[PDB]
């Protein structure tokens, strides 16, 4: 069960979803993988091939009292080479469905212990305005939050862009890193019901 702060209604949520042992390694791996997915990795140096110049030997092999050289472009020279030049690469890494679900089940269950998960009934601002949302969180005693909702209101969305420490994401689009990052998590009764069914 999960009590509310303006009703005290017994929302009987599943045991294994919101009440399991916090597996650290899984969560760590999934959040690290999620971070690694965020990278675009758009970078490139140029190999001795790719550098502009000639392939001609600056001086002949023998005869001259100098270190044998083949090109201007060689990485031991100045102004051309970079031995192992990088290529635009994809750092995103695979995560198993059961591991991603297991990690969400692991982190979302730990918020019930730490009391960061503030489950609520209907949560929605009157008109599309930040001023009201900023004021109404002072009564709720919140600052840095992830307001999860089932029915995503444009009124509520538009009202929480400009606020830095608030973020409004849909119950469908919850993430591993976000649930960990934010200092509290305000879930709607519908959103809990959706996420329960989604994670299963």
């Amino acid at each position: 069960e999960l009590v509310l702060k303006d009703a005290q209604s017994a929302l009987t949520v599943s045991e294994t979803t919101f009440g399991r042992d916090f597996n650290e390694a899984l969560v760590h791996q999934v959040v690290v993988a999620y971070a690694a997915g965020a990278r675009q990795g758009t970078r490139a140096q140029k190999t001795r091939a790719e550098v502009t110049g000639s392939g001609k030997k600056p001086w002949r092999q023998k005869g001259t009292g100098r270190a044998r050289s083949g090109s201007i472009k060689s990485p031991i020279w100045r102004s051309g080479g970079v031995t192992f030049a990088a290529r635009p690469q994809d750092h995103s890494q695979k995560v198993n469905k059961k591991m991603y679900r297991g990690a969400l089940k692991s982190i979302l269950s730990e918020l019930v212990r730490q009391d960061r998960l503030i489950v609520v009934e209907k949560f929605s601002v009157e008109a599309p305005k930040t001023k009201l949302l900023a004021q109404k969180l002072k009564d709720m005693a919140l600052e840095d939050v992830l307001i999860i909702t089932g029915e995503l209101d444009e009124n509520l969305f538009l009202a929480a862009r400009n606020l830095h420490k608030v973020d409004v994401r849909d119950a469908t689009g919850i993430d591993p890193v976000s649930l960990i990052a934010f200092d509290k998590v305000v879930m709607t009764a519908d959103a809990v019901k959706q996420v329960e069914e989604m994670l299963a």
Partner: protein
């Protein structure tokens, strides 16, 4: 847990062998590949199954057999995955929808893998002498 507080399980990560980095690294100067020779060099080493010019094992032995085309289009149905189709009818097209065997497999055979419960009438399918005892002992009549 916060974003900093997390950590991996002890044993997960293992750094990586960084060659050519001083004496203290152990490996460093000739990074774990000895002094001179073909193997030490960049792009070094020989190709697969090369025994220094001696006639390799994969050539000094005679080649045998031929690959059967009929063996490609036959399956070995394990009797454990028998009652997973449509009650108790397992011809071929029915079995194929259950994803037990591949699409291009006309011939097929049921072997004694163990465990049957429901009565399954195994029609239009070759069946083994041990499986014929089991399948009937469960209840279902073959053919």
């Amino acid at each position: 847990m916060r974003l900093n507080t997390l950590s991996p399980a002890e044993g997960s990560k293992k750094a990586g062998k960084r060659l050519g980095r001083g004496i203290g690294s152990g490996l460093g100067k000739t990074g774990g590949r000895g002094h001179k020779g073909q193997k030490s060099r960049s792009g070094g080493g020989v190709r697969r199954g090369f025994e220094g010019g001696q006639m390799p094992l994969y050539r000094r032995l005679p080649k045998f057999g031929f690959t059967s085309r009929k063996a490609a289009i036959t399956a070995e149905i394990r009797l454990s995955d028998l009652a997973k189709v449509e009650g108790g009818v397992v011809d071929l097209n029915t079995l194929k929808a259950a994803n037990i065997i591949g699409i291009q497999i006309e011939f097929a055979k049921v072997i004694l893998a163990g465990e049957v419960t429901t009565p399954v009438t195994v029609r239009g399918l070759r069946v083994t002498k041990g499986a014929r005892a089991a399948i009937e002992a469960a209840g279902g009549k073959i053919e």
